[PDB]
Design a protein around this ligand. Structure first.
Ligand SMILES: Nc1ncnc2c1ncn2[C@@H]1O[C@H](COP(=O)(O)OP(=O)(O)O)[C@@H](O)[C@H]1O
Ligand SMILES: [Mg+2]
Ligand SMILES: [Mg+2]
Ligand SMILES: [Mg+2]
Length: 1284
């Protein structure tokens, strides 16, 4: 369909069926639950193309082809009422941005913009007027989409509005009233003293302020941006305090400056790392090489609490996105490496899985439920991390909502406004740590996507692939070393350009003159205020010397990263924004005026302290307590938050959340290698204990620090001063007792605990409005969060290989408890108390600073000495949970006696005091106990018993059995929360299969069977000649797994060349010079239009490049490998590859969820030259994909493929049989197929990532006897030997 559309033409192309059977059934079932009699429903994707010029027959065919993607679902003829769901008018979906890029890269410049909607066909002849509105409501997100009655109504999405002019606020003509009116109208939230400041400022300038100027000032002076609370003077209980909160945090750096390279001077802190081989492609040669040099470590943690309460998916996604920009914009450019995620919400109240302690207290109509946040939120956060390409290796998840007698008496305390935390680490070059000076005349650039009106105002938008393109530019820049063109760089976040640019020039001691019309925009109707202040994502601002512009342009064009020079740095510290369209100046202000601060804040507050009531144990029994606690989400298995996120990208992940053969999510901390050629690395851990703040503020803070330390303790670090902390403070400022509580908590860690331990807090953030208000009936209600300190610990690691996990060994052993609680056994504010709807009397706390320090030092000694078999610290759920989780990870039993822990067994088992359980060889018990005593821990150390083969979890006290149960029974209970979450979020069949598998104790876990010598380097004789064949390491925009792929071929003797698709189109690289080629993994074009489709079609539609690939494949001796995204791409290039007529397609996983797993596969017999000598081998491999399901045309196609013998890899369960059961087979591929080859065996494509696990240290779990090389290194060596 082609119809007139403004100055353009809009083409409407019907797509493929949009909903799988279980999704359709889920909708129908939801209609009956609302009494809406719907007989049937059918959905179909519909595409809209805004054309600025005609498409000839060939181009039209290409467009239609581009829009043919997705699973081959059941098609039906439209019947019933049409309800078209599309993005809301005035908004452009990320799908649109990415789909339009593909169209352009396929030579279809006539396509102005591509957009997509979903056409629903509902058969229901009974519904009234309101019922139809209820049906429509169930088919769309009210915050992001709209429902239309005709496909033609999609024309509204492409309306071109004329540029709105700037508006002045008539201060000179109406007086102060004009500022008061503007304050209310524009929602400036200006204080009286700020209005006074602006009044004098403009009266002095003798002109009316423009709306844009007032808006810029208001955002810059918001609590979020200025951090007034953290810089305020204090008066506590009638006594003026010497330091501000920020000053007390800075005290930790003053006491411990050790290893710190940068703190409180950038968007992230930097600490010393290790000298290792930084691997990247040279600018002049394009060849990947190791560069021995210090890879310093950067760290940052941020939050996106408010946005997430309104729109969870975008809120969490941009939470990660904004934090990733902070990392890349550190110093003069840096590279993100790994991330962490945190979530705090109210009770889940899962339908049909209600827990005893949960009560519905209602909530504001304007926000989403805790369950909605934990459903869409994690997916959004993982969506950004997966698409951008950074592993998410650690995090926390707490649920809390209860009517408690706290500091301000009986009140509702919880997280209606959630904590959505995102952070991570990165690496940076020594000479790029410090920001450079900005020379006068420097070009001020905006790197990133075009602006839109996003700064409904709380609904964000994420395009991870755009940020990936930007990161590639930043990488090319720091990779130029001393030639790095970046003089200064900063991320664009709150306030948008209105905050970012003034801040950039100000930090350089310069001013700046900008041109409004030079900024890239996706919506012409935006006013100067909107263009300058919108909070559009994936944008960076930087300064570049004028003579370096041509080089910068070259770098951006090659990566397809949009950029625009929008201004120039000036000597005069003045801010000027000109508008060439309206011929005026929206902004004309001296920086000292715009950035001028109103009088410092002074908070005169008083201490409120809850009394705390003894725990009522009337309804409590140890057995029932165990069952309830394992059912608290905070304690329960976190699989639904772990497998949805990539944990292997970069190939530098040594320790992820999933532990052992049984892949149980219980790792206490994350560990990454510093490079692909070293055992040095980085570790991340989190400590948090918010509920404790409802009884004791300082205790909660001290415990957060303490837990971060106990979680990271079993990693080889050494000096405690190596551990650096990020302190993120969440609180309901102004709420009774919270202010004084915050000061006391900050003082407890900044002035006392951390300085005594030798811990620096060089970074941090604060969120001061953690409370929600609404009217339930006729009365007002409020939900206030406890003071919530989240401590994230980061540290350089001495040896990644020596990290211990909770996986118990069944060899002769001794289990020893290190009770830092010193027998206090506090039960206040514990999982046990919460589970029984109580708060308790007294909570845990750091009982002895010296012993905590001694504990860390003792653990470091034991780790370095290799005297530990396992370690698991105590936190939520207490000793009971610690022992249970170790039993789960080791898939064994436990026999322990707690008689020495006190007569109160409930308190002994459930207290959440600091400490944990170490497992040591029986023959080492005496020596270990002696070592602990040397650190003064003698009275805190207790021998509990031993881990034993079997399924019995037994706790005794002398001759009395305290608690006894099947370990498997506990394991399954502990898994029920993630089961229920997966069942409602994903394909229920898959969720059930994964859960049921856990109940089978006979599962042997991942295990290996090799058909060859893993240590035999069959490529060695070839490498020894010095002759190194080149391999084209192919990448398209969005590809993110190229570095490790290059490193794998390098290890095998190849000269890895970075070949971007732009290089092929530009003629800079020709495939005729290569004998080997590899298509890498990632999210090319964000997988829009089908994973690997845009990449493949951009090749097919550009006849010159299509011919280049076809010629390559048709040569007699060439070899090609396609992995993950590359496998999908090559499968869409069948027409160019000989012997590939039987290849299947790769579509959406049966689970309908991204699967990041460590799966067991078996190498099958095929012509594959890359798998030579490996047939019959069975070993685990990294799986990380959302569209890896093998899909054939029909069974004739499957039978043909199989009979031809082209299947090279198959998923097998732990018992060793080919399987289609989930998650053994993570995607649902028929006959477990996950790799196929051509008839001649010269081309092989596979979904798993061999290159992410070619190093043994990068294998989540692996046999203890393996050396540096894993089985997967053989693929690359086979390639080298084959080329000869
Ligand atoms: N939101 C989350 N995202 C990703 N991983 C998470 C999240 N919450 C917890 N995890 C991971 O799940 C495992 C168990 O979490 P948790 O029980 O909170 O750990 P601990 O008690 O050791 O602090 C850890 O490996 C942790 O990193
Ligand atoms: Mg835990
Ligand atoms: Mg722990
Ligand atoms: Mg924890």
């Amino acid at each position: 369909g082609l119809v007139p559309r403004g100055s353009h033409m809009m083409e409407i192309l019907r797509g493929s069926p949009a909903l799988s059977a279980f999704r359709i059934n889920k909708l129908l079932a939801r209609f009956q639950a609302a009494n809406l009699q719907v007989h049937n429903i059918y959905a179909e994707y519909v595409h809209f193309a805004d054309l600025n010029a005609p498409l000839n027959d060939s181009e039209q065919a290409q467009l239609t082809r581009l829009l043919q993607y997705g699973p081959a679902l059941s098609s039906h003829t439209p019947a019933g009422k049409l309800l078209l769901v599309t993005p809301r008018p005035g908004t452009i979906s990320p799908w649109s941005s990415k789909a339009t890029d593909i169209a352009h890269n396929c030579g279809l410049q006539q396509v102005d913009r591509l957009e997509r909607g979903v056409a629903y066909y509902i058969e229901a002849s009974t519904l009234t007027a309101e019922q139809w509105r209820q049906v429509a409501a169930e088919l769309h997100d009210r915050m992001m989409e709209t429902v239309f009655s005709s496909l033609t109504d999609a024309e509204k999405l492409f309306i071109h509005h004329q540029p709105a002019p700037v508006s002045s606020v008539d201060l000179l003509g109406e007086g102060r009233q004009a500022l008061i009116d503007a304050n209310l109208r524009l929602g400036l939230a200006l204080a009286e003293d700020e209005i006074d400041y602006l009044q004098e400022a403009f009266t002095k300038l003798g002109r009316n302020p423009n709306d844009i100027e007032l808006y810029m000032f208001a955002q810059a002076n918001s609590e979020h941006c200025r951090h007034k609370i953290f810089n305020a003077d204090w008066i506590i209980d009638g006594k003026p305090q010497p330091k501000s909160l920020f000053k007390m945090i800075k005290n930790t750096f003053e006491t411990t400056p050790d290893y710190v390279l940068s703190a409180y001077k950038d968007n992230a802190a930097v600490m010393e790392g290790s000298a290792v081989g930084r691997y990247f492609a040279d600018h002049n040669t394009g060849r990947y090489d190791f560069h021995q040099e210090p890879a310093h470590i950067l760290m940052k943690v941020e939050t996106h609490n408010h946005p997430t309460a309104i729109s969870p998916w975008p809120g969490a996604a941009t939470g990660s996105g904004g934090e990733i920009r902070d990392e890349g914009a550190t110093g003069r450019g840096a590279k993100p490496k790994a991330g962490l995620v945190g979530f705090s919400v109210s009770n889940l109240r899962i339908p049909g899985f209600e827990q005893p302690w949960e009560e519905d207290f209602g909530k504001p109509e304007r926000i989403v439920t805790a369950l909605d946040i934990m459903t869409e939120g994690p997916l959004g956060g993982a969506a950004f991390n997966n698409e951008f390409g950074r592993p998410a290796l650690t995090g926390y998840f707490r649920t809390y909502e209860e009517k408690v007698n706290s500091h301000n008496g009986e009140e509702l305390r919880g997280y209606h406004k959630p904590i959505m935390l995102a952070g991570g680490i990165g690496n940076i070059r020594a000479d790029h740590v410090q920001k450079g000076e900005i020379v006068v005349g420097a070009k001020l650039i905006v790197l990133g996507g075009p602006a839109m009106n996003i700064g409904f105002a709380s609904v964000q938008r994420d395009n991870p692939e755009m940020e990936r393109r930007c990161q590639e530019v930043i990488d090319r820049c720091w990779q130029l070393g001393d030639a790095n063109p970046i003089l200064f760089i900063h991320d664009v976040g709150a306030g948008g350009l209105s905050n970012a640019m003034p801040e950039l020039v100000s930090d350089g001691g310069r001013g700046g003159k900008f041109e409004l019309r030079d900024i890239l925009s996706d919506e012409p109707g935006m006013s100067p205020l909107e263009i300058w202040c919108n909070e559009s994502q994936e944008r960076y601002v930087l300064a570049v010397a004028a003579d370096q512009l041509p080089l910068f342009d070259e770098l951006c064009k090659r990566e397809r990263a949009p950029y625009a020079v929008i201004g120039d740095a000036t000597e005069e510290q003045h801010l000027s924004l000109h508008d060439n369209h309206f011929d005026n100046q929206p902004i004309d202000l001296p920086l000292d005026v715009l950035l001028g601060k109103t009088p410092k804040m002074t908070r005169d507050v008083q201490t409120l302290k809850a009394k705390g009531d003894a725990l009522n144990r009337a309804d409590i029994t140890i057995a029932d307590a165990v069952k309830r606690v394992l059912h608290l989400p905070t304690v329960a298995e976190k699989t639904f938050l772990v497998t949805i996120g990539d944990r292997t990208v970069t190939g530098m992940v040594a320790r992820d959340q999933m532990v052992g053969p049984w892949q149980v999510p219980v790792a206490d901390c994350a560990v990454t290698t510093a490079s692909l050629d070293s055992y040095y690395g980085e570790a991340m851990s989190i400590g948090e204990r918010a509920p404790v703040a409802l009884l004791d503020f300082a205790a909660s803070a001290r415990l957060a620090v303490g837990e971060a330390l106990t979680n990271i303790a079993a990693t080889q670090i050494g000096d405690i001063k190596r551990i650096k902390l990020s302190a993120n403070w969440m609180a309901a400022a102004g709420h009774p007792g919270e202010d004084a509580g915050l000061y006391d908590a900050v003082k407890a860690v900044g002035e006392e605990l951390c300085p005594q331990l030798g811990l620096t807090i060089p970074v941090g953030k604060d969120s001061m409005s953690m409370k929600t208000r609404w009217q339930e009936g006729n009365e007002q209600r409020e939900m206030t969060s406890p003071l919530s300190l989240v401590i994230s610990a980061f540290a350089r690691v001495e040896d990644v290989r020596h990290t211990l996990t909770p996986q118990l060994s069944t060899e002769d052993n001794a289990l020893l408890l290190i009770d830092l609680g010193k027998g206090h056994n506090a039960l206040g504010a514990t999982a046990l108390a919460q589970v029984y709807r109580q708060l308790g009397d007294k909570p845990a706390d750091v009982r002895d600073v010296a012993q905590l320090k001694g504990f860390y030092d003792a653990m470091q000694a034991l780790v370095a000495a290799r005297k530990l078999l396992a370690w698991h610290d105590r936190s939520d759920g207490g000793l009971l949970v610690t022992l249970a989780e170790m039993a789960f990870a080791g898939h064994c039993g436990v026999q322990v006696d707690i008689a020495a822990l006190g007569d109160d067994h409930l308190a002994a088992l459930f207290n959440e005091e600091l400490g944990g359980v170490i497992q040591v060889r029986a023959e080492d018990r005496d020596a270990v106990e002696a070592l602990l005593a040397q650190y003064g821990l003698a009275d805190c150390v207790h021998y509990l018993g031993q881990a034993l083969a079997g399924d019995r979890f037994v706790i005794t006290a002398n001759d009395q059995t305290v608690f006894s149960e099947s370990r498997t029974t506990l394991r399954v209970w502990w898994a029920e929360t993630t089961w229920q979450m997966q069942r409602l979020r994903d394909n229920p069949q898959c969720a059930d299969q994964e859960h049921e598998a856990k109940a089978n104790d006979t599962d042997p876990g991942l295990n290996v069977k090799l058909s060859f010598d893993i240590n035999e380097d069959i490529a060695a004789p070839y490498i020894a000649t010095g002759a190194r064949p080149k391999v084209a390491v192919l990448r398209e925009q969005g590809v993110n797994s190229h570095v490790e792929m290059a490193a794998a071929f390098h290890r095998a003797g190849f000269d890895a060349i970075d070949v971007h698709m732009s290089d092929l189109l530009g003629g800079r690289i020709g495939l005729g010079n290569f004998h080997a080629l590899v298509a890498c993994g990632g999210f090319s074009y964000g997988d829009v239009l089908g994973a690997g489709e845009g990449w493949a079609k951009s090749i097919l539609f550009n006849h010159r490049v299509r011919d280049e690939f076809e010629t390559f494949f048709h040569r007699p001796q060439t070899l090609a490998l396609g992995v993950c995204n590359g496998c999908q791409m090559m499968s869409n290039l069948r027409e160019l590859i000989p012997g590939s007529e039987l290849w299947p397609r790769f579509v959406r996983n049966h689970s309908d969820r991204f699967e990041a797993r460590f799966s067991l596969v078996e190498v099958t017999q095929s012509p594959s030259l890359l798998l030579q000598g490996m047939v019959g081998s069975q070993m685990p491999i990294a799986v990380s994909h959302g569209e890896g399901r093998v899909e054939v045309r029909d069974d004739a196609h499957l039978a043909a493929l199989e009979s031809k013998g082209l299947v090279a890899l198959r998923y097998v369960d732990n018992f060793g049989k080919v399987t289609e059961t989930y998650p053994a087979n993570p995607n649902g591929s028929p006959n477990g197929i996950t790799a196929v080859t051509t008839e001649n065996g010269r081309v092989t494509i596979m979904m798993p990532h061999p290159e992410r696990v070619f190093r043994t240290v990068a294998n989540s779990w692996h046999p203890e006897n393996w050396g540096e090389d894993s089985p997967w290194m053989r693929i690359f060596r086979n390639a080298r030997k084959q080329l000869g």
